């Protein structure tokens, strides 16, 4: 069992006293429902189970999986948060939207062939960024795996121009990959002295059906901490809050402040919570205000975060010509991102806030996207812009927020 406490003044990223969330290790490869099995073989199958509900956003939300990689009755020093998002374009839009996201990219390569999914994974890893290649096609012939490793090293030699210098060709291979990740991936610099900002990715309800009148747990929200340290008892600040359009016009966003009753991770976490993991906070919020993924997209600040709820953001429209690494055998005008037409939906992924927005107006250098829900990240943050190509949200461009229209009710 852990021995953490509420006595801390200046913690570190590689502190062994916490042993809950130290670093994050993203994974974007050619999995096709194969990376979750690799994360379960590396960490645990039924290890991450705190509060489940109906799967609302499967491809839009990213799943974090903690792994306490020990060494030597073993000793644990640092833990790695395996971020396995469904769809490599969602992880690429979240990493290429600012700083401190997908610090240790893991290229889940396959020793079967050199198909275009690995090319799209290499393009997403180059657009995101420390790479970590790992061949998952186990149990092959010796000469066949040698030729496949030669082909993969020839593909990664073209990858070595940008970032291509990892080397890894069933439990012993996973242990060797864990040792190489513990020896190669350095501790990234995280800002602990700032205010805690918990971007919610998946909210849950801890109150069961037909519970007692006094035994009522409300508002067990879940997300990721961008920077800072969150302690139990500090009044969190939901910056989006309750958005109500009852005034028959522009909707007002009332920020609901809630006292943090507990910080409950996948294990029994302590009062202090650091960044780099799926931080779960059970605050003093109502069950109707925080339903199943209802309070998602809300920046749960701590000290009154400066980011106000913007309704329409005018950013610099900079769309790519073709899709990053997506090129099939036909290519009959499929990899061609069109211009930003009027009244077109776009999935702007500002950091972890993936909000939809209609293209209201644009004149050749800047699109004024009117967002559906209120978003509050910054005034000049790097905002991405995605577009559903064929039943899948794929990234189309990036930009910087040039102007906005803020609103803050009380």
């Amino acid at each position: 069992l852990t021995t953490l406490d509420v006595t801390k003044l200046t913690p570190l990223s590689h502190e062994v006293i916490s042993r809950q969330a130290t670093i994050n290790i993203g994974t974007i490869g050619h999995v096709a429902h194969g990376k979750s099995t690799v994360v379960k073989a590396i960490s645990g199958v039924h290890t991450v189970r705190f509060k489940n509900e109906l799967e609302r956003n499967i491809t839009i939300k990213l799943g974090y999986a903690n792994a306490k990689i020990y060494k030597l009755n073993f000793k644990l020093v640092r833990h790695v948060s395996f971020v396995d998002c469904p769809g490599h374009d969602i992880l690429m839009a979240t990493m290429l939207n600012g700083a401190a996201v997908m610090d240790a990219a893991l290229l889940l390569i396959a020793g079967n062939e050199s198909c275009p999914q690995p090319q799209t994974s290499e393009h997403l890893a180059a657009i995101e960024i420390h790479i970590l290649i790992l061949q998952n096609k186990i149990d092959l012939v010796k000469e066949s795996q040698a030729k496949e490793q030669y082909e993969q090293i020839l593909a990664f030699v073209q990858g070595t121009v940008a970032e291509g210098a990892p080397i890894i060709p069933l439990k012993y291979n996973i242990e060797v990959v864990c040792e190489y990740i513990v020896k190669k991936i350095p501790v990234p610099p995280r800002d602990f002295t700032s205010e805690p900002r918990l971007i919610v990715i998946r909210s849950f309800d801890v109150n069961k059906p037909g519970c007692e009148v006094d035994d009522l747990k409300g508002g067990v929200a879940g997300g990721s901490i961008l920077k800072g340290v969150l302690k139990v008892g500090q009044e969190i600040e939901v910056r989006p809050g309750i958005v109500s359009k009852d005034s028959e016009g522009k909707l007002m966003c009332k920020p609901i402040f809630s006292k943090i009753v507990s910080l409950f991770a996948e294990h029994n976490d302590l009062q202090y919570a650091a960044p780099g993991g799926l931080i779960g906070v059970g605050t003093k919020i109502d069950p109707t205000l925080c339903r199943a993924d209802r309070m998602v997209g809300q920046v749960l600040g701590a000290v009154g975060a400066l980011p106000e709820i913007f309704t329409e953001l005018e950013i610099s429209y900079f769309l790519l010509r073709r899709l990053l690494g997506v090129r099939t055998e036909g290519d009959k005008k499929a990899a061609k991102v069109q211009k930003l037409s009027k009244n077109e939906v776009l999935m702007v992924n500002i950091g972890s806030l993936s909000t939809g927005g209609r293209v209201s107006a644009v004149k050749a250098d800047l699109g004024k996207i009117v967002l559906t829900n209120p978003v509050c990240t910054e005034v000049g943050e790097k905002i991405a812009l995605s577009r559903r190509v064929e039943k899948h949200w794929r990234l189309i461009g990036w930009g910087q927020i040039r102007r906005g229209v803020t609103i803050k009710p009380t």
Binding site: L251, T288, R322, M347
Partner: protein, 590 residues
């Protein structure tokens, strides 16, 4: 459990123009009764206890129209909730507003504000509740269709709907329209996913009375790209193992159900209402309790209001409705038509398949076929109207002016056809082409060096070419882009001027592509091959050799090794200009 309903009182398509610029489409009367009153009567006869009306455009007029109705009285069993906002502009905006407000609980109806129906859907909601209790809330939407032949004038060509469903369990597998399609394409995974039975259906007229679960509002909150209903079903059917949510279907054969979006749908639904196809909802029954709309039903579906004052010789043969106070002259001939309240008709007139609203004034000798006259209209004598003519909100038509077939006249000039008055008269090659297109787009849109390097890396990862091959392809594209500025000049000056600013602006991409010494030797070999292919500008071939050393692309040692390495290329490099450039480079180096 109670029965909630969502009513979209603003269909966001630009079809009833410029009729909608006067009064919204849900307030237009079929037979002296607006469409929202028909929809509220259908909802009250269904068994709905609470509705949620949503109004975007001209919403205050809708509010003052329905506030004096039967459904906002305190004696009404069906309570309404008037919700208006100037922000929403689509049905998915309405449903995500419902999800943000959390109004419904479970198994709520979703309907437009211009739906004419008399279906009791208790069997369909029994089947939907049984499927939700059986499959543990897996089935979400239960669409409702009516059996109809495809030749019927109700279903027009703009919204003829072909589905592919199961006949055993009534689940929807495919959904599409026939908006300009002679051959219809169907997928194949529906047969492999259900090997027990499958059927295609073109006999289904869409009523848009899709009763839903609140997971519809959940998926509309998630998917922002889903703008309307068929967008939602076309995104739900093509993605089955993610967000499963199998839509089921109900088919009605003994009750009526439709909506309006054309003049054709308006005319067909009005002719079905006058011919009592939507019984019990008939105009002589007066389901909206108003003394200005009650009628008496004569033979041959002739509805007569109070104080009409018919004249001698006026004959009504089939499907005629006369409102309150509409005076009719002598020797008239009215058939298949709806006449509003308080109208004035002249003498010796014919009126077939026509829709006269309130306040109009028809003079003598006028012949009107298959048209629509809106409120407070007027027409003089010696006029004859053609089929599919629209007169809108007090347009006066002068004498001796016959309108053509396509005719829409209103007070707004650009939305209608005219405006009237008292007078009517006024492998490696594809990668090279992609790199050339990316370079042309970066030169046109003035893209930065980082985005250009990212696009070049994405093209190199997609084409899976070698590093030296990609460097040679980039050098050939940079040589061809400077040669494309001049069509047939065959001179060194224009090629050198096109190659100097291109190498000056794209120097970072050339430094990122050609980095090693072998890459510099490959770039020198590609420059020699480009000078051999562009020998008419070969006097500029030394000018690029002084440029690559200036922009730090090719080093001085690499240039000396390329000049020392020899053939036709050695004879081209042994010229006076290349030797002078090599001497200048050796003097400037040290």
């Amino acid at each position: 459990p109670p029965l909630q309903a969502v009513l979209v009182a603003d269909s966001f398509d630009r079809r009833f123009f410029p009729i909608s610029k006067d009064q919204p489409r849900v307030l237009l009367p079929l037979a002296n009764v607006a469409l929202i009153d028909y929809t509220l009567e259908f909802l009250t006869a269904t068994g709905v206890q609470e509705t949620f009306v949503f109004c975007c455009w001209k919403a205050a007029q809708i509010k003052e129209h329905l506030l004096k109705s039967k459904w906002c009285r305190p004696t009404s069993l069906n309570v309404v909730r008037i919700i208006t906002s100037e922000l929403y502009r689509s049905l998915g905006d309405v449903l995500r507003d419902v999800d943000a407000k959390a109004l419904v609980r479970s198994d709520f109806l979703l309907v437009y504000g211009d739906v004419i129906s008399n279906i009791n859907i208790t069997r369909a909601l029994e089947e939907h509740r049984l499927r939700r209790k059986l499959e543990k809330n897996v089935s979400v939407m239960t669409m409702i269709f009516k059996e109809s032949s495809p030749s019927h004038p109700t279903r027009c060509h703009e919204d003829n709907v072909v589905v592919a469903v199961d006949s055993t369990t009534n689940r929807v597998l495919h959904f599409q329209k026939t908006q300009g399609l002679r051959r219809f394409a169907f997928p194949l995974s529906l047969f492999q996913g259900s090997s027990d039975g499958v059927e295609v259906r073109y006999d289904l007229l869409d009523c848009h009375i899709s009763i839903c679960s609140p997971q519809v509002a959940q998926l509309f909150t998630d998917n922002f790209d889903y703008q309307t209903r068929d967008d939602f079903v076309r995104g739900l059917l093509v993605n089955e193992e993610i967000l499963g949510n199998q839509i089921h279907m109900h088919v009605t054969a003994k009750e009526y159900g439709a909506r309006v979006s054309n003049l054709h749908m308006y005319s067909a639904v009005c002719a079905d209402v006058i011919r009592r196809w939507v019984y019990p909802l008939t105009p002589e029954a007066n389901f909206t309790d108003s003394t200005t709309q009650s009628c008496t039903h004569s033979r041959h579906n002739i509805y007569r209001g109070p104080e009409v004052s018919l004249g001698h010789g006026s004959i009504l043969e089939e499907n005629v409705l006369l409102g309150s106070g509409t005076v009719i002259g002598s020797n008239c001939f009215i058939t298949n038509s709806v006449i509003g309240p308080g109208c004035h008709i002249g003498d010796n007139v014919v009126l077939d398949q026509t829709y006269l609203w309130q306040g109009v004034r028809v003079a003598a000798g006028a012949q009107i076929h298959q048209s629509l006259l809106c409120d407070n209209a007027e027409v003089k004598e010696r006029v004859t109207l053609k089929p599919r003519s629209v007169l809108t909100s007090q347009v006066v038509v002068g004498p001796n002016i016959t309108l053509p077939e396509g005719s829409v006249i209103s007070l707004h000039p650009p939305d209608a056809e005219e405006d009237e008055d008292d007078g009517e008269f006024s492998d490696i090659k594809v990668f090279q082409n992609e790199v050339l297109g990316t370079l042309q787009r970066g030169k046109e849109e003035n893209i930065s060096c980082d985005n250009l390097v990212l696009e070049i890396n994405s093209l190199k990862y997609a084409y899976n070419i070698s590093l030296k091959e990609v460097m040679q392809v980039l050098s050939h594209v940079v040589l061809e882009f400077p040669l494309q500025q001049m069509d047939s000049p065959l001179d060194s000056s224009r090629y050198c001027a096109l190659l100097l600013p291109l190498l000056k602006a794209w120097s970072p991409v050339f430094r990122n592509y050609i980095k090693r010494a072998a890459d510099h030797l490959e770039a020198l070999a590609a420059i020699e091959d480009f000078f051999l292919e562009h020998e008419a500008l070969g006097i500029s071939m030394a000018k690029v050799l002084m440029a690559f050393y200036q922009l730090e692309i090719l080093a001085e040692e690499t240039i000396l090794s390329w000049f020392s390495q020899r053939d036709k290329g050695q004879q081209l490099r042994k010229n006076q200009q290349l030797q002078r450039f090599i001497q200048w480079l050796k003097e400037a180096e040290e």
